[PDB]
Paper text:
In this study, we analysed new crystals of the NavMs pore that contain only sodium ions and diffract to higher resolution (2.7 Å), enabling us to identify the sodium binding sites in the SF. The NavMs sodium channel pore protein was purified and crystals grown in the presence of sodium ions. The pores in these crystals are in the open conformation, with the activation gate at the intracellular ends of the transmembrane domains of all four monomers splayed to allow ions to exit the pore, as in Bagnéris et al (2013). The locations of three highly occupied sodium ion sites are seen in the centres of the selectivity filters, with ion B‐factors similar to those of the protein atoms. Densities attributable to partially occupied water molecules are distinct and can also be seen within the SF and at the bottom of the SF/top of the hydrophobic internal cavity close to the local anaesthetic channel blocker binding sites (Bagnéris et al, 2014). The sodium site nearest to the extracellular surface (NaI; top cyan ball in Fig 2A) is located close to the site that had been designated S1 in molecular dynamics studies of the NavMs pore (Ulmschneider et al, 2013). Below that is the site we designate as NaII, which is closest to the carbonyl oxygen of Leu177, and is separated from the NaI site by ~2.8 Å. NaIII corresponds closely to the site denoted S4 in the MD studies and above the proposed SiteIN. It is nearest to the carbonyl oxygen of Thr176; it is separated from NaII by ~5.6 Å. An important finding is that there are no protein atoms within the normal outer limit (3.5 Å) for a sodium ion coordination sphere (the closest is Oγ1 of Ser179 at 3.79 Å from NaI), suggesting that protein–ion interactions are mediated by intermediate water molecules.
Author numbering:
A (entry chain B): 131 to 220
B (entry chain A): 131 to 222
C (entry chain D), D (entry chain C): 130 to 220
The structure:
Amino acid sequence: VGSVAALLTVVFYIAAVMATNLYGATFPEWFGDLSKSLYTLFQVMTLESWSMGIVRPVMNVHPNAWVFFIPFIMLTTFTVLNLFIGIIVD
Amino acid sequence: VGSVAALLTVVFYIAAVMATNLYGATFPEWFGDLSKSLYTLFQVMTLESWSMGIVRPVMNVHPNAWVFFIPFIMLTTFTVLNLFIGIIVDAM
Amino acid sequence: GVGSVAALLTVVFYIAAVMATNLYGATFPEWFGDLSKSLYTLFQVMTLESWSMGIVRPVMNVHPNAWVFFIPFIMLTTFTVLNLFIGIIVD
Amino acid sequence: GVGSVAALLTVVFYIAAVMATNLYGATFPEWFGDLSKSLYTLFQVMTLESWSMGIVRPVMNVHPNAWVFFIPFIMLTTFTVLNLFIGIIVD
Ligand SMILES: CCCCCCCCCC(=O)N(CCO)C[C@@H](O)[C@@H](O)[C@@H](O)[C@@H](O)CO
Ligand SMILES: CCCCCCCCCC(=O)N(CCO)C[C@@H](O)[C@@H](O)[C@@H](O)[C@@H](O)CO
Ligand SMILES: CCCCCCCCCC(=O)N(CCO)C[C@@H](O)[C@@H](O)[C@@H](O)[C@@H](O)CO
Ligand SMILES: CCCCCCCCCC(=O)N(CCO)C[C@@H](O)[C@@H](O)[C@@H](O)[C@@H](O)CO
Ligand code: NA
Ligand code: NA
Ligand code: NA
Ligand code: NA
Ligand code: NA
Ligand code: NA
């Protein structure tokens, strides 16, 4: 559980660093700095407007953006589910 | 389960009191009174338009509003999941 | 002449903005929360930009008779502006 | 005559587009990221299409005094265009 949460923090911070570099200049409201990127990737993890609100507008500039966002969702959503179940069982 | 539901009610009511004070004057449609705040925080808990519809517009006026809403989601979402699983287990 | 028309529009914009802040400022603080915000919104209403779908219909869900304020304001300002612009061309 | 008015509008559109790219290009790259994008957006602003709900209100959330740029631009361009179009009809 402790290591699971530690892995989720490392993944989250790395992805937010990656996103700031990739989409920061073209999408500064969602990825303009590390703080904006951490907030946006938390929203994308909760699946809230991830495609219509964020990734479809981003794909209009960066057509391969789905290679970043779909594996991010698959990874964080699975880990969050695994972590919350882990706390309840332990 | 009973205590879990009791904790969720106390958390929900306290947060709705907090939100009415914080965002009531600047966002009266969503937090103008305790009834509006309880409804909005139920919507935020279900994750429905929580960021695009509510917290991003709120952050344009109150930049630190994420310090309220992200811990609220993390807490209530985890508790609801824990409560629903608890009812199912204490039935089998 | 033109000067009196430009002054008339200024007075109308000030009176309507004070009134809009007073009536709708508590319920709609983004568009009418203070004189500056109201002056900006009333200008947007005069240009007919989202005046109904974006401003007046949301306001009427709280203040049902709000159309009595905004429809006469549109009728007055879009007439005054039409008269002012044609007035400058003639003179 | 008409030629000088059409040239005046061209110069104004170039100066405002360079200024809009310089001021708002980093924070709003879709509408002001370069001269081409700004020229397109300023034309859209002149036609009064979503100028406030779609462009200026989002910009003012980052640049609060942005209204001092866009409101005088609208007042100037919608006047020049009105004078130009009436000018062609007369001549
Ligand atoms: C799972 C771990 C989740 C961690 C989430 C951390 C979020 C931190 C957000 C933050 O520090 N902000 C700056 C507060 O000063 C908010 C930004 O996102 C904000 O600048 C933008 O959203 C603007 O566009 C709003 O006007
Ligand atoms: C569970 C398995 C999920 C698999 C998901 C695969 C997605 C593959 C998407 C893809 O290959 N695109 C083309 C990338 O070249 C993206 C398209 O959506 C694209 O045609 C455009 O809509 C955007 O690029 C926006 O303009
Ligand atoms: C008489 C002819 C019309 C003249 C219009 C004058 C507008 C002056 C607006 C002003 O002084 N502001 C303060 C900043 O300089 C603008 C803001 O108060 C407001 O427009 C928005 O920022 C809010 O609606 C955001 O919620
Ligand atoms: C050129 C002549 C234009 C005259 C316009 C007269 C409008 C009269 C409107 C009216 O009498 N209302 C009743 C209350 O005063 C308002 C409502 O009928 C309506 O505008 C909306 O509030 C609804 O659509 C909401 O679902
Ligand atoms: Na969902
Ligand atoms: Na949605
Ligand atoms: Na949704
Ligand atoms: Na329009
Ligand atoms: Na429109
Ligand atoms: Na129009």
